[PDB]
Ligand binder design. Sequence first.
Ligand SMILES: Nc1ncnc2c1ncn2[C@@H]1O[C@H](COP(=O)(O)OP(=O)(O)OP(=O)(O)O)[C@@H](O)[C@H]1O
Ligand SMILES: [Mg+2]
Lengths: 53, 45, 53
Amino acid sequence: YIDRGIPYRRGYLLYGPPGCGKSSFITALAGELEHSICLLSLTDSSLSDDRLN
Amino acid sequence: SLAENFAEHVLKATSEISPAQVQGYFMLYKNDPMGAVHNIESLRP
Amino acid sequence: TEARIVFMTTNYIDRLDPALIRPGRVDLKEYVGYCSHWQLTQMFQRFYPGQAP
Ligand SMILES: Nc1ncnc2c1ncn2[C@@H]1O[C@H](COP(=O)(O)OP(=O)(O)OP(=O)(O)O)[C@@H](O)[C@H]1O
Ligand SMILES: [Mg+2]
């Protein structure tokens, strides 16, 4: 990513009918990769553009 | 073969079954594979 | 959080969004309707103990 100037970011989207295993798979993947989860709620009251950034 | 039979029976019973409903159905029959294989018809909407 | 039991009640089940009640968010739905013959008999026996069935 660095050698080509591409920003070192990535995003994933999981879509489907409820109850199919999106959140459970996200938890399992976070456990497998030994990462932590930063839960962010966009529809909050104290959240602003600068605060989101 | 029990797993294959259960899968075939469930797919014949209902068309769109979510994994959460399957988990709940398995919760209903704990440590009783025979009962789970037998009582497929309860999953029909 | 694990080790939690949640009880929910409503009068118009048709008004609940299906995503709110799914097998893993609500593990058992039961219908509490009007009285039946056996229910009335039991209520009469409890309210007036000693009487003949
Ligand atoms: N593929 C699966 N394997 C095992 N369990 C599953 C699977 N899919 C769903 N479940 C079960 O369904 C329940 C809830 O699943 P989950 O929260 O991932 O679903 P969702 O509808 O994607 O969630 P959300 O409402 O958070 O977006 C849990 O009990 C979970 O174990
Ligand atoms: Mg989920």
